[PDB]
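S.,

As promised, the adenosine-5'-diphosphate run. Input:
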Amino acid sequence: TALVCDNGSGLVKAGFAGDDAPRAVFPSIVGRPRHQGVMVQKDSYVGDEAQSKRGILTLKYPIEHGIITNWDDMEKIWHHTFYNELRVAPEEHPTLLTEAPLNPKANREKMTQIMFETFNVPAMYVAIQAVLSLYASGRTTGIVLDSGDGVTHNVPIYEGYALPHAIMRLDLAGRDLTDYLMKILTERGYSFVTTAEREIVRDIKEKLCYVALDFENEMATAASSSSLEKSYELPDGQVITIGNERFRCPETLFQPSFIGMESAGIHETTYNSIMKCDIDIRKDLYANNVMSGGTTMYPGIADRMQKEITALAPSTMKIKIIAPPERKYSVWIGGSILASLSTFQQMWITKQEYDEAGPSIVHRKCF
Amino acid sequence: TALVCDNGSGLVKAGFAGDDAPRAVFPSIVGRPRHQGVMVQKDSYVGDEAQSKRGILTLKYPIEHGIITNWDDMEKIWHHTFYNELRVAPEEHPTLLTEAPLNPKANREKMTQIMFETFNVPAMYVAIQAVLSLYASGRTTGIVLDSGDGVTHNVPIYEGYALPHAIMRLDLAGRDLTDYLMKILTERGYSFVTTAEREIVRDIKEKLCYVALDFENEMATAASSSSLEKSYELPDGQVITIGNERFRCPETLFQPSFIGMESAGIHETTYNSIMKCDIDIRKDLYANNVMSGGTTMYPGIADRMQKEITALAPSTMKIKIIAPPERKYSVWIGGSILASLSTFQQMWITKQEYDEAGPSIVHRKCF
Amino acid sequence: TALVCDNGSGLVKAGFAGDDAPRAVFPSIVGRPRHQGVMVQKDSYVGDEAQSKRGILTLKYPIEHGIITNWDDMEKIWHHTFYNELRVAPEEHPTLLTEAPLNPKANREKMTQIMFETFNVPAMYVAIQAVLSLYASGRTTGIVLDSGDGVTHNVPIYEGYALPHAIMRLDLAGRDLTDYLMKILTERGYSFVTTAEREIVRDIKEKLCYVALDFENEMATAASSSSLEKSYELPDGQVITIGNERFRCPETLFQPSFIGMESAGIHETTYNSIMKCDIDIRKDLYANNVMSGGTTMYPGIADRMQKEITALAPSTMKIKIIAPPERKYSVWIGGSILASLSTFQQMWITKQEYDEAGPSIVHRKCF
Amino acid sequence: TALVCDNGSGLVKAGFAGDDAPRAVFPSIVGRPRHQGVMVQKDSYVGDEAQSKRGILTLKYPIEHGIITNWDDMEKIWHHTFYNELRVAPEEHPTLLTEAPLNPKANREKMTQIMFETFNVPAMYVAIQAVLSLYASGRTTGIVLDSGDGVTHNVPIYEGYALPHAIMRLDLAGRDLTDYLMKILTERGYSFVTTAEREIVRDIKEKLCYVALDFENEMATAASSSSLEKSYELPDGQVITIGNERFRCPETLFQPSFIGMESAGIHETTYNSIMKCDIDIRKDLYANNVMSGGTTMYPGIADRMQKEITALAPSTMKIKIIAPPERKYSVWIGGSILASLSTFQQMWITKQEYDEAGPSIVHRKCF
Amino acid sequence: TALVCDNGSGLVKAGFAGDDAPRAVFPSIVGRPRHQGVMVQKDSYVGDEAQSKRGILTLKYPIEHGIITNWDDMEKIWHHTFYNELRVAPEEHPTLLTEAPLNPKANREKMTQIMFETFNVPAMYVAIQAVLSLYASGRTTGIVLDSGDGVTHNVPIYEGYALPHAIMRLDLAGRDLTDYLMKILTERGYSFVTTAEREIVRDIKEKLCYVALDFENEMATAASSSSLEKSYELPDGQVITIGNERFRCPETLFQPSFIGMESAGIHETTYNSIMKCDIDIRKDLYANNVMSGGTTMYPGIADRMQKEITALAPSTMKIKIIAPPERKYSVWIGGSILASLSTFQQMWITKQEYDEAGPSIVHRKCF
Ligand SMILES: Nc1ncnc2c1ncn2[C@@H]1O[C@H](COP(=O)(O)OP(=O)(O)O)[C@@H](O)[C@H]1O
Ligand SMILES: Nc1ncnc2c1ncn2[C@@H]1O[C@H](COP(=O)(O)OP(=O)(O)O)[C@@H](O)[C@H]1O
Ligand SMILES: Nc1ncnc2c1ncn2[C@@H]1O[C@H](COP(=O)(O)OP(=O)(O)O)[C@@H](O)[C@H]1O
Ligand SMILES: Nc1ncnc2c1ncn2[C@@H]1O[C@H](COP(=O)(O)OP(=O)(O)O)[C@@H](O)[C@H]1O
Ligand SMILES: Nc1ncnc2c1ncn2[C@@H]1O[C@H](COP(=O)(O)OP(=O)(O)O)[C@@H](O)[C@H]1O
Ligand SMILES: [Mg+2]
Ligand SMILES: [Mg+2]
Ligand SMILES: [Mg+2]
Ligand SMILES: [Mg+2]
Ligand SMILES: [Mg+2]
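Predicted complex:
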């Protein structure tokens, strides 16, 4: 049986191929103590253990914007995933890994070298995350908008063919929305500065933030009453109240200039990706907008995407956003489907063909 | 029962002798994927299946200007015709094939070798397309103007005798008009460049183009108003509007200098063919101008031919253009009539006389 | 009842003795297809059927200058005459045939062998054409000038006696005038070259040509105006105009040097024939010039003959040209009179006396 | 000194009387630009200048079948001949022109009117081309077969007397052979359609075509091997190979039915011309068959003519074909001899006698 | 004196006719501030001023693929060109403008309306860019391959005549190569996303990119060593190193499938354009391949074009690429030559004839 490990910038989703949900879901964090130990305590903490002790830790994400920046810490996370969360021996399970498109080549080359030389897996494979999301939805045609913690990317696929020249990638996702919410919470006098407090702000975002259908009408509503204001209790019992910050934070996805980015919002990027595709496949792409990832879980985002793309596309086109309730795990679920296919068993990169080609084998066997 | 297969440059018309319409009509195209397959898809697509997936295919016509240029792809089309469209075993049906006059000898020699050695037909026959059009009209006398996708040819026939020295052939037909319409659509800012977009332009032509009775008066009318402008919705919902391009594209048939050809238009070519015939048969040829093929289906082309030839011929001659409503299938219908005649059953090239003479038997048994 | 068949070089005149006009008059031509048959058509065409399809035929005259040169084709014409035009069984009708004087002996010997062994006539007879013309006019004395398509001959007859030493024969008649008109029509740019176009020129001659009373005064008139120019519409609607060719073509009869012949014109030949006769019969011959045949049908030819012979003969002689309006059929009409005479019923060559003497019986029973 | 200008359908041969070769030989063509001029180029090009720029020109022959059909273009060619090729003033040189026999009268009438009123020559003369060929050979007796680009004609001459009734003319010559070679080159897939490509085909003919001694034995040889196949490099570097087309194209001269003509071949036409002559001159005509013109330059044509006429003539007659190596210029060389004769200086049509008679003077002073 | 303004998709080249180099060369960009102004700054920046402040601007090209898409911004660029770079009054200088072939009609109609109604020029003219390149090389014959920032086009010209049916246009040029280099620089971890960073990538391309003579041998060389790797210092002092990206970016010109285009490379397009021309001009076109524009400035592109076309053309043809060192300004230099010709002074569209015909005068006076 194969292991499916979706290493996001934010969460690790790991499990066994054939299952319908990841067995292990924990934050992709390494924490190290930043204070003085006085009682006669590990040197670092991974995952949920780092989250429960974050008050005395400095928390580091080894993956930023889909790119592994700390390889020593990433190896701690993979080690924790295999031996503590799944409790398997990696040397007997083929491992399917995931990646964002348009990543640096050295990223998946080092993932291959570590899987084969540190964990000694028998076979591995690196899939593109948006492609796995289309497996999860049971489709062969559609434009996938995957947005997690690090990357937002669009991959148009038609009858199982990717249009790589139409792939869009935007380094604006959940972690940038968390940083923006931290910044605009200072307007109400709430100061979150440490890495542990950034975890509190992320939890505020996941519970209170939503996408306004019309942003300017929502700003006028929040300015005329308090029907939109909600409260949130902090870990120490302090209660904070937020109003228009609830929809200003997700609005950055549609207006990246809020955080100083020049790029277009996710609706324009989806439309630009479709318009780069051949005219004869555009109608099928308009009807099959698949959303996946945690950053697509905001209340009202599919209705907003529907409205924004409808305004860009021709009036005769039927725009349909496919936002399944389980789309937070679509990449893992699709990787579980793929790794269980009998047609896929020839696609693995085995340890034998890695020894005769080195880590560059991953560039000619994986899309 | 015999198979009648009219292999045009543009369409395959195939069916059974005795019927009144082809059973299978599909585009004579082979499509191959030009993008990267990512989901775990055939290697090539033929006919209507290539048309429905043309967004991700590069489309190739194996026949250009009546001449088969890709014999591997032509065999895919014949295989698709026999086994998928008609669903017959070719080894038990005599097969009537069609050809344009003044084709290279090797073209019908290779058609014979493939019918007898790849499909193992019991008997076959290659007829001239314009002759079959005269069978379809129930005549034995007339000058046939057949214009399809590849070839425009004139064959004068009198009392069942062809005048081969008066046969005219012009490599200017539907596909050259499609290419010209693509070129003049750039004047309005519409860019069609790929082979899939050429299929869209062909559909625009078949719906909006017509033959002006007086070209220069029509150009002045289109320049003074918008009564001639029509709209067309593209596959992706974009609406394009065209005005004088509607009649400028078919005008190339009467003025081949629009596409840089030195030859005369179809009206002068018809007249030159009649003037090469003996003076005593010209009056019967003037009264029996038979038009066939898809390129004669433009609205107003028989009225324009009538007016153009009347101006070339003597004033006492009665010019009559026979343009039946079913003339798009005249070659197939005439081949269906011919293959059902009891007098024709001695004309087949049987497998026995092919084995004692080789593929060159086709040159002494078929006109 | 007897059959009367006048086989001219140009026309067949056939009918029944006792009638006053031939029942069947058709061209003495055999046509064979010279093009490629493509529709699934006889091997040869005779008579009026060859004339209506002459555009695709090569036309052959089996009789040239009164002499049958193609015996297979002549038998097709006789077969067509008996079974298709007259619709009789030749084996029950005595057949009167005609011939020009001074023909080869083998010509009428083969006519006898074919009538008795191919058509099995009960009796036959070969008459001289000029003698039959004198029966048609009701005379027993006169010099007959018979001119058809092949031969012009003079036969002086006095009180029912022929003067055979005074018989003149000139191989210059209608077909040579047609060939000359074809040649001089090239002066105006009209090109008639094929055998079908020779039939068109013959029709021009029969409608527009006439005999000038004074040739040199007519040439000066045609050169000073256009009062003599006439138009003629060709079968394909082209209109041709001819001026002095109208009387230059018949002038060859009076000046055979126009076509390179050394012989004298028909007026000198008539006079030379009379001057070979005995002096005591010349006065009756001068008063009884009988003209017959199609080549004597030109407007103005009797007036020209009258003027030419008057200038040759003594001033005291009364020259009279007998040119009846029906003289185109005089040979047939006279043969109809002869074959109906009760005195002629002993003159037939019966099948019984042909079996005991062979085909040479015709030389001792027919003049 | 006199100018000798032989205006063929294909080439202009011009020079000075007394010389032994034409000074100017160039194609009788007028070219006009058929494309759009973009750089800031004459309106028409004549002769060799039209040949070097034929890629962007439409080429017109003003003479077709010996008859000048475009008088404006013919005047450009004469103007180019006098002022650019010979560089003379025509108003001081008597000009000998040539013509085919049996041409329209208006052709040489307009040549006379243009020479006297446009170029103001002092005197001119129109000779028959075949007669000049007999001057070139130094004979007074012989039957001349002249075949150029437009006309094939036979003129029998005996002791300086022409037999005009025996003159044959056939509108089948070099240009019809070029058109036929273009047609049968399509059997191998070579398409020559434009007027510039017709010039390429003419060059192929002049280098590769020959006359087979026995046509049917040559067809069997070409079908059993490749010893007859030759290659030819096109102007753009493409190499074409032709086999039996090399002798099928000249075979049309002996079998005009290849191009749909009903007439007899040049061997039968030569024999028919001799048989129209008086019996006492035929033996001298059989021994003096003079061939001239470019269409008699095929390798093997004199041997084929010798064999064909020997089979038609009586076995006791000595058939001799006189085919000199310089017979391509025989008409010009003979016209140079004639215009230099002291006996010819009374034969010119002077400007004085043209003013008192008009252009019709040419019909009573020139044969 | 005339103004010559070559408005490319990338650069403005402007100057005075008669000069040998453009006086003003600046980027065809409009920049607008995208940040918040805090110090108490224009609303937009044009040209080199937009390039020096691009850190705080969003940069827009008003011309895309040779077509002006933002007419307000294009008018800012023309205004900046006249009044700030050249420092002239446009109302006293005739202005020669340039355009790519096969542009929309409305593009040059709006250029004419703006020149006459906004800048009030006395006269103007719109030339085709490839034609001006042939003026710059001093030729009248040649096939021009012009490739700038927006368009690659081929125009074959022979003796000053364009063959418009053989004009090829490909919307793949410098800006598409810059976008592709941006995409493949992500393989090494370099992220350029903003419009200002696209200007940095364009500068990398112009300094480090070259055309490999053999692409697959170059890919093997770059994979076996580091002899091809070069460094580049970014504006902020960061040093980037690139290896095979140096020749993969220009390889898109020969393999447009790298960016998902179905079209053929520039070598096949040049050959297809020549093969659409008449066979008699192809040899002169093969010897006169003129390259112009900034996208032909890659090291090794003429050697690669020479090798690619040699492999397509017949072995006997002499392929010669004319790539002058100043070909980056060939369109301007040729327009300077043209606007100085005395023959061109009648070709201007004057303000007088614009008032009587409207902006559509440009379609009947300019090619
Ligand atoms: N209900 C929610 N509403 C808004 N954002 C959410 C929600 N749940 C998760 N997220 C955000 O999704 C991001 C990552 O989710 P995931 O799809 O697992 O991405 P990754 O694969 O990068 O770990 C996190 O930044 C988190 O804040
Ligand atoms: N209604 C129409 N108007 C104009 N053109 C048409 C129409 N229908 C078909 N055609 C053209 O006819 C051409 C071929 O038709 P067809 O007679 O089947 O030719 P072929 O035998 O070469 O396939 C195509 O190029 C198509 O564009
Ligand atoms: N009206 C006419 N004028 C002049 N020639 C005529 C006329 N009618 C017939 N002919 C000519 O008479 C010739 C033969 O007529 P006919 O007396 O029947 O001769 P034959 O007996 O040889 O057939 C033909 O060549 C025809 O051209
Ligand atoms: N060597 C050759 N072999 C065959 N044909 C030739 C040759 N040379 C010339 N011709 C043909 O001769 C024809 C005309 O030659 P020429 O005698 O000058 O005729 P004209 O007088 O009509 O110009 C041309 O059609 C040319 O193709
Ligand atoms: N040395 C060089 N190497 C490669 N590309 C270049 C070079 N110089 C300029 N270019 C490219 O040429 C393109 C435009 O140049 P130019 O010929 O001025 O085109 P335009 O007329 O469209 O402005 C730009 O995209 C630029 O990147
Ligand atoms: Mg993810
Ligand atoms: Mg067809
Ligand atoms: Mg008669
Ligand atoms: Mg000649
Ligand atoms: Mg440019």
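Chains A and D do not touch (no CB pair under 8 Å). Chain A has four domains: 1-29+63-126+329-363, 30-60, 128-173+263-324, 174-259.

- D.
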